[PDB]
Amino acid sequence: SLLPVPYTEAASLSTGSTVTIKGRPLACFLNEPYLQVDFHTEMKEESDIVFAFQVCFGRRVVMNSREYGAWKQQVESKNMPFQDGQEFELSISVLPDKYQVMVNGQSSYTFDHRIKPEAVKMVQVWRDISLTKFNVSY
Amino acid sequence: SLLPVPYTEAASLSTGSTVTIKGRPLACFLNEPYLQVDFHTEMKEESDIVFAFQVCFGRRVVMNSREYGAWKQQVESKNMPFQDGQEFELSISVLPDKYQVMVNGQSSYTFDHRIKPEAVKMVQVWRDISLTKFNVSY
Structure with missing residues (x-):
């Protein structure tokens, strides 16, 4: 909807920073849409990722980093507070x-x-969502 | 680009039908964009899927059906003819x-x-692609 997706924004973070996102999945949970938020070390999409947060709505969340181009140790959670639709x-x-x-x-x-x-x-911020708000506390 | 994504089109298929799609991934293969093509039994997105074709670009393809709302036996292939970018x-x-x-x-x-x-x-046809052509041979 309001913001383009994939949405890319330059950012600086430190202790006390907050990234706030409002959006909606593009499909019902039965179809397993994804949401991903990636914290990159450079502006290019191929740069390293300090924190990748990937939701498979209704199924699982996986988190990881990509260091020197290599995905590292994946972490998985089945916590699913997101609500269908x-x-x-x-x-x-x-x-x-x-x-x-x-x-x-x-x-x-x-x-x-x-x-x-x-x-x-x-x-x-990308994958199967519409995005209406993206804010970094500065 | 040219066509909306997710792209949904009513269709009838039989032996000799061909569905042709031209598109491009929205991200480099390092970021593992997806492509999915779902053959549905009804117009609603929650309806059963006779054939779901899901590419994780640079990684794998999985195929399945969703019958009475339940995903069935997944099939996987590591064949990856798609070219990065x-x-x-x-x-x-x-x-x-x-x-x-x-x-x-x-x-x-x-x-x-x-x-x-x-x-x-x-x-x-949905997930992390731009779509320029969709055609069903009739």
């Missing part, structure tokens, strides 16, 4: 030791920093 | 006993009919 509000906050992922106001996932968040230069 | 031409032909998937003019995947192709009423 509904708009969601997603908040990713930078804590001292990890990212905190809030969904609709509830803590839902965490991911320990593998690389300092100060390495981030770009955030990309 | 390039437009592709995909042809799905209905043979008497199976679907034949051509990629850029080469036979690449097959999938035996689990349900008669005459059950199809709709084709949907």
Whole structure:
């Protein structure tokens, strides 16, 4: 809808930064749409990813990093606070030791920093969603 | 680009029908964009799927059916004729006993009919691609 998808925005992050996203899946959960949010070290899409957050709606979440072009140790969660057919509000906050992922106001996932968040230069939001809000607290 | 994505078109299929698609992934293969083509029994996206063809570009292809709302036995192929960053031409032909998937003019995947192709009423093409051509031979 309102924002282009894939959505790419330059960004700087440190402890206390929050990335807030509002959007809606493009398909019912039965069709397993995805959402992905990638925290990149450079503006190019092929650059390393300090934190990749990938939702398969109704099924699972996987998180990982891509370092020197290589995907690293995948982490999986079956927590699924997202609601079929509904708009969601997603908040990713930078804590001292990890990212905190809030969904609709509830803590839902965490991911320990593998690389300092100060390495981030770009955030990309893509896959099977419409996007109405993207904000980085500065 | 030219066609909306997700792209949904009513369709009737029988032996000798061909569905031809031209498109391009929205991201480099390192980012694992998807392409999916679903042959549905009704116009609604939640209806059963006689043949679901899902490409994870650079990684794998999985194929399945969704019958009475339940995904069935998944089939996987690591054949990857798609080229990183390039437009592709995909042809799905209905043979008497199976679907034949051509990629850029080469036979690449097959999938035996689990349900008669005459059950199809709709084709949907979606996930991380731009779409410039969609044609059903009639």
